[PDB]
Symmetry: D3
């Protein structure tokens, strides 16, 4: 019955591990921005293989669960930095925290 | 067409690789529980980085929303700090009989 | 205000790292077929532990994730059901931006 | 931050206003059984027009909507499938606050 | 591809037609508030029958499709006014407008 | 268990009872279209009140998300002002064969 929010969204950012932004690993910059943006949190996963119609470059997935508006901000910031990968989003229910 | 269940939910427990319980790893204890409560199954992942050093540990469980809640109750207290999430999903297959 | 595709779904296939199909690592076989079929993409994860409903506990979980249009996913599931023994396949909507 | 129930779903049953089951208006029969079973609730709508895949065009649509926990909906669908001829039953999640 | 929003929510308010608030029909007051609240819009339906474990009182359903935050406001305003009925919410995608 | 489709979407077209097209009621014209494009089916509702006198008219269509989009294109222009919505749904049955 108790839930933090019912309009929470799960954002997933798929990029290659070697993708770069101004010489730095794109995922680190992305995670860096999320931090100074005051976003709830994030989890980064590294796949063992991946491919996108549109492998020395393992997949890295940056996942962020937050309120809708916050996630909209993030997409608007990160869209420019990503020329190859994908961004998905779907609702989810957050039950606990700390 | 055929599916296994259209009433299932995906439970995701986000904790810390270093989180402990009564002396043991919080994820190993949870999985033990889940296995003794008769849950459908579970899959544990370890991220490379996370913020909410410590590696994020995510135990995932897909089952009747009615087992998931049974699971939520028994774990809500053990998770002093972290996050629990849940959302619908359809289980299309398991692969017990081929035809 | 602009999303890439119409009706996309996220397929997740769970199997064992040690699973095989005709002497080959089942997941690589699955990924291969997906590519051949012309699927939008796929990501493969390796878990550190997992259990279901006779498999070694040291047999790590492998999750093959595919995000694509509905008919495509339908087609994928149609092709890989025969190769999934005692695993699991899930699907649910998502929006790809 | 407080929702009433865990895993609720919205069942929608589509049938014809003129449909019958043992000489009675099928929808009233469905609603009756739902009540007997102890279902959380139900709402019935009457459309002004509808068509599917031999029924009069003047035979208005009747939609029986049920919002309840998963197992309950499972049970409902199990009971009314036999009474639904050339209609439609849909389901999808929802959160009841 | 073109969509107004991806974090739109469909809110549904189920009450009886005779339900009242300070002597006026509860649904009219509800619709009245939504209007002076600047909400996107709303559609009211009247069922031909209904029942809630928790019929001379036909069901009235007030439906509102809007951004998440707006819908949160609405729930917070209307929750007090409703002692018998139900409030559901799930995501939806808005494609067009005017 | 068995279902009809887990890939379907529910399309909802909100217009005005008085909205017209080339001289006819916008909803009657849409339904005509939907029937000639071979869509699974449709259900039309008339609210008692709405604001976005005029009665709100809602044509609902459940079908492959691939027919729904075919439908969206052909109607987006006809709907000068109103609203179109879409979201997933599972079609559990149709009732053609009992067993
Ligand atoms: N449709 C998809 N489904 C699952 N994973 C995807 C999909 N599309 C892209 N990816 C992942 O994102 C990465 C794409 O990187 P890139 O090819 O440079 O655009 C791949 O390594 C995949 O693991
Ligand atoms: N209900 C479930 N929830 C999460 N993962 C599952 C579930 N069921 C099966 N799996 C995964 O699929 C595999 C099942 O194979 P097995 O242990 O031989 O039955 C495990 O390694 C799990 O990672
Ligand atoms: N909103 C979120 N989205 C994605 N991952 C999260 C989120 N919140 C927490 N996490 C992860 O879950 C773990 C628990 O949070 P913490 O106790 O602060 O370390 C962290 O290691 C994070 O990586
Ligand atoms: N679980 C439900 N599913 C569908 N409709 C419901 C449900 N619960 C309540 N309703 C509708 O909301 C109204 C409840 O009013 P009341 O009994 O006064 O609380 C009924 O007339 C029903 O049409
Ligand atoms: N795909 C659909 N979308 C919306 N309503 C439907 C759909 N299929 C069936 N229906 C409803 O179910 C009834 C079908 O019965 P029939 O016309 O005899 O085949 C119609 O009156 C519709 O209101
Ligand atoms: N956001 C919304 N939620 C529920 N109903 C709506 C919404 N927006 C528009 N409508 C309905 O759709 C119809 C079209 O809007 P309008 O052209 O302004 O009259 C109206 O009669 C409203 O009742």
């Amino acid at each position: 019955v108790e839930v933090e929010h019912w309009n929470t969204l799960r954002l997933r950012i798929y990029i290659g591990e070697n993708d770069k932004w101004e010489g730095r690993p794109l995922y680190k910059v992305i995670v860096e921005k999320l931090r100074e943006m005051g976003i709830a949190g994030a989890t980064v996963y590294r796949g063992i293989y991946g491919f996108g119609k549109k492998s020395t470059d393992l997949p890295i997935i940056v996942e962020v669960v937050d309120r809708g508006h916050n996630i909209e901000k993030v997409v608007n910031v990160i869209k420019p930095m990503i020329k190859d990968g994908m961004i998905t989003v779907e609702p989810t229910i957050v039950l606990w925290v700390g």
